Amino acid sequence: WKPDEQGLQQILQLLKESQSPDTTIQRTVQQKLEQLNQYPDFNNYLIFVLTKLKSEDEPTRSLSGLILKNNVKAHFQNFPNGVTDFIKSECLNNIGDSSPLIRATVGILITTIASKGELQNWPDLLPKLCSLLDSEDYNTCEGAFGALQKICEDSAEILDSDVLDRPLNIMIPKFLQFFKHSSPKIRSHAVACVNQFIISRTQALMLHIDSFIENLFALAGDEEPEVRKNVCRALVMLLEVRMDRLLPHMHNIVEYMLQRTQDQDENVALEACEFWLTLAEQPICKDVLVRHLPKLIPVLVNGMKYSDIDIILLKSDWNLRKCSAAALDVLANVYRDELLPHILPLLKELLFHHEWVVKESGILVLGAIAEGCMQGMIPYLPELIPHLIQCLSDKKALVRSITCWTLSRYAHWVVSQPPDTYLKPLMTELLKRILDSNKRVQEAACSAFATLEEEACTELVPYLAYILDTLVFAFSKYQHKNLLILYDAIGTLADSVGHHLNKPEYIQMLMPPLIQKWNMLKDEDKDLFPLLECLSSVATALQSGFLPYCEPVYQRCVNLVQKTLAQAMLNNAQPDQYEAPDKDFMIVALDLLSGLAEGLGGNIEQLVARSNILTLMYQCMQDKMPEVRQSSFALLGDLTKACFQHVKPCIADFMPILGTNLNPEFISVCNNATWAIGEISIQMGIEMQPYIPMVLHQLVEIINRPNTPKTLLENTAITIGRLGYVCPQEVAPMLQQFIRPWCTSLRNIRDNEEKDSAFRGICTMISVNPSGVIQDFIFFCDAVASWINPKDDLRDMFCKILHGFKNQVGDENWRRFSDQFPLPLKERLAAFYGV
């Protein structure tokens, strides 16, 4: 290229027309450039003005390159080699321009050509840059390094790989050799680079581990906080990978770490903070920390205190405070209530202080030790709770956030003391603090309310009338983001009040807004889920009062499924054309689809019959994906008990699917399948007969194997009791082998519909093969002495079994059993049943 008048001037005036404080002048240089940015003579003219042309002033020459780097980010593929060739040159030839802004832009280009234009493509890049660290001109080195320092952060995983020659072999020890440099900026860079690789456990570095720490810790000091920053940062990561190095000098490190944790440079303490956080990560020595634990805590607590500069952002990402609080939590868990001694005195001083700031911090601490110091905290609570509830009214905005969130952290104690005494007033304000005109306070409040509900499980039934009226109105006032939380707040509600929610007026205020949000949501919406998720709970607790809304909702649910399988099938056919579906869409549709099939019960026969469900049901159960199979064995069982009338013909199609899916390694997936077989079991009656053989033996094995998640064991014992009821002659021959685990797992369940459906079996079985229980009768009795209310005949069924056996052994030989009894069991037995 070179000169050419017309172009250069046109360029210059474009760049001059740039800095105009005009708005309509701006829309000109946009298109009037986007047009030149398709005309390849362009970019070269940029680097020229940037580099060669020293006549024009400097901020121009900066915008020169800026645009260039802007094109390199966008249109680089185009850039003919002959441009790129030259671009590369002028930047290395001007790596250390003695005019800051230029030096920085020029490096920026390098940074950018390296990252966007591969690195297998700029072979000279590093080799040059290195040789430039070894330059005399200071500026032509600060530049040479600054680049490398970015290249490492950028192409970390590439530098440490087979692409050039693993230059990491030569750069690392070179970087180390540069710790002993004078001017701090260069040392700070020196370590900065090294750091990229400490996590990455690079062999090019480990080879000098000894020498590294040596140069690192021996260095520690270095007045300039830029260096201290990265040392601190090194040690943090170094603590993770090469723990087996720091121990020797551990005690000096930790004492040092407090000074740097209080380094007046916020940005240094910022990092030093994450030290203890990462220390506490490996619980490889709880003892070491105690030494100076009374010293750290107070410091750490002051970190919470809102920086005077944050009252501007909120009145972000990760600040000292956000780190400090996060670190305190973890310390509470390792140390338990033993942490409290150093904390209580300090707390006292905050919590009340004149400051709509320092008080707030005290509150934040209260929430940070909530769970790890949970027990030692119980005593005081009757003091703070009171005030804390008052605190939800504190005039300053941000206080009303933590005041709230800290309370959520204690719900378990609130829901352990008399309903009216603590819950009542809390949920009053907590609820009013939802309607607050401060988004941050709003969201905090609902999340607080959500937690509160998972703990109530029954206490809200009184206050539902008020709860809803505000929550349903909460939509009239909640932007998209705080709307997500409501779905859960609703979800938890119906999920925590049970059926009680069914009321023609309660429904009145709740359904319209939901259906509103429903229709504004297309069938592709990825935030559709949330709506369905709680709708599952809602349709569940709302029982038959949900009928007004299902004929669409149901059909809407099947249609997701329908559409999803088609997507997958076509993908499992033309991956090169149609991409994979998002199965997480079925999962939901399926969950809601048994959500109705639960509380909507027998009525479903309508929608089930005139629906393709029971083939989409078949396809989903074969799915290579588990979460799917889980919630379609679920739907199966639900439907099975809701309307087996329609389900029957597909049994010999389904049974094998379940029988295969009794693979215990899939936790929940099989837990459902097991339960499912139980529901079919009953609904089939004797006709279950042909199926028992395969499933049965597995069920035994499952229930007989130890370490089999408690929930599954129950879901298995019941199913075995189900089969033994419906087909006694076939299962009773096995009694001897599975009585023990059955009893013990089923000894601890609520005497619900299922427990009965199980014990009826175990008896019908006992009455076929009595010899089954002779050695483990003491097991069996411990199972009976769990029944509070046995359904008339069932109570007489047990008493008949007990009395029956006491006769073959007789009186003198009954003591050989009875005396062995634990005190409760003997007392409930010789009481509620027979002698």
From Swiss-Prot:
<dbReference type="GO" id="GO:0005829">
    <property type="term" value="C:cytosol"/>
</dbReference>
<feature type="repeat" description="HEAT 9">
    <location>
        <begin position="342"/>
        <end position="370"/>
    </location>
</feature>
<keyword id="KW-0945">Host-virus interaction</keyword>
<comment type="function">
    <text>(Microbial infection) In case of HIV-1 infection, binds and mediates the nuclear import of HIV-1 Rev.</text>
</comment>
<keyword id="KW-0007">Acetylation</keyword>
<dbReference type="InterPro" id="IPR040122">
    <property type="entry name" value="Importin_beta"/>
</dbReference>
<feature type="site" description="Important for interaction with cargo nuclear localization signals">
    <location>
        <position position="675"/>
    </location>
</feature>
<comment type="function">
    <text>Functions in nuclear protein import as nuclear transport receptor. Serves as receptor for nuclear localization signals (NLS) in cargo substrates. May mediate docking of the importin/substrate complex to the nuclear pore complex (NPC) through binding to nucleoporin and the complex is subsequently translocated through the pore by an energy requiring, Ran-dependent mechanism. At the nucleoplasmic side of the NPC, Ran binds to the importin, the importin/substrate complex dissociates and importin is re-exported from the nucleus to the cytoplasm where GTP hydrolysis releases Ran.</text>
</comment>
<feature type="repeat" description="HEAT 12">
    <location>
        <begin position="464"/>
        <end position="497"/>
    </location>
</feature>
<dbReference type="Pfam" id="PF03810">
    <property type="entry name" value="IBN_N"/>
</dbReference>
<feature type="repeat" description="HEAT 16">
    <location>
        <begin position="652"/>
        <end position="685"/>
    </location>
</feature>
<dbReference type="GO" id="GO:0005737">
    <property type="term" value="C:cytoplasm"/>
</dbReference>
<dbReference type="InterPro" id="IPR001494">
    <property type="entry name" value="Importin-beta_N"/>
</dbReference>
<feature type="repeat" description="HEAT 10">
    <location>
        <begin position="382"/>
        <end position="409"/>
    </location>
</feature>
<dbReference type="InterPro" id="IPR011989">
    <property type="entry name" value="ARM-like"/>
</dbReference>
<feature type="domain" description="Importin N-terminal">
    <location>
        <begin position="29"/>
        <end position="97"/>
    </location>
</feature>
<feature type="repeat" description="HEAT 11">
    <location>
        <begin position="423"/>
        <end position="456"/>
    </location>
</feature>
<feature type="repeat" description="HEAT 19">
    <location>
        <begin position="778"/>
        <end position="809"/>
    </location>
</feature>
<dbReference type="GO" id="GO:0061608">
    <property type="term" value="F:nuclear import signal receptor activity"/>
</dbReference>
<dbReference type="InterPro" id="IPR000357">
    <property type="entry name" value="HEAT"/>
</dbReference>
<feature type="repeat" description="HEAT 2">
    <location>
        <begin position="39"/>
        <end position="77"/>
    </location>
</feature>
<keyword id="KW-0813">Transport</keyword>
<dbReference type="GO" id="GO:0005929">
    <property type="term" value="C:cilium"/>
</dbReference>
<dbReference type="Pfam" id="PF13513">
    <property type="entry name" value="HEAT_EZ"/>
</dbReference>
<feature type="repeat" description="HEAT 5">
    <location>
        <begin position="169"/>
        <end position="199"/>
    </location>
</feature>
<feature type="repeat" description="HEAT 18">
    <location>
        <begin position="736"/>
        <end position="769"/>
    </location>
</feature>
<feature type="repeat" description="HEAT 13">
    <location>
        <begin position="505"/>
        <end position="543"/>
    </location>
</feature>
<comment type="similarity">
    <text>Belongs to the importin beta family. Importin beta-2 subfamily.</text>
</comment>
<keyword id="KW-0963">Cytoplasm</keyword>
<dbReference type="InterPro" id="IPR016024">
    <property type="entry name" value="ARM-type_fold"/>
</dbReference>
<feature type="repeat" description="HEAT 4">
    <location>
        <begin position="125"/>
        <end position="162"/>
    </location>
</feature>
<keyword id="KW-0677">Repeat</keyword>
<feature type="repeat" description="HEAT 17">
    <location>
        <begin position="693"/>
        <end position="728"/>
    </location>
</feature>
<keyword id="KW-0539">Nucleus</keyword>
<feature type="repeat" description="HEAT 7">
    <location>
        <begin position="251"/>
        <end position="278"/>
    </location>
</feature>
<comment type="subunit">
    <text>(Microbial infection) Binds to HIV-1 Rev.</text>
</comment>
<feature type="repeat" description="HEAT 6">
    <location>
        <begin position="212"/>
        <end position="239"/>
    </location>
</feature>
<feature type="repeat" description="HEAT 20">
    <location>
        <begin position="812"/>
        <end position="832"/>
    </location>
</feature>
<feature type="repeat" description="HEAT 3">
    <location>
        <begin position="86"/>
        <end position="119"/>
    </location>
</feature>
<feature type="site" description="Important for interaction with cargo nuclear localization signals">
    <location>
        <position position="405"/>
    </location>
</feature>
<dbReference type="GO" id="GO:0070062">
    <property type="term" value="C:extracellular exosome"/>
</dbReference>
<feature type="repeat" description="HEAT 14">
    <location>
        <begin position="551"/>
        <end position="602"/>
    </location>
</feature>
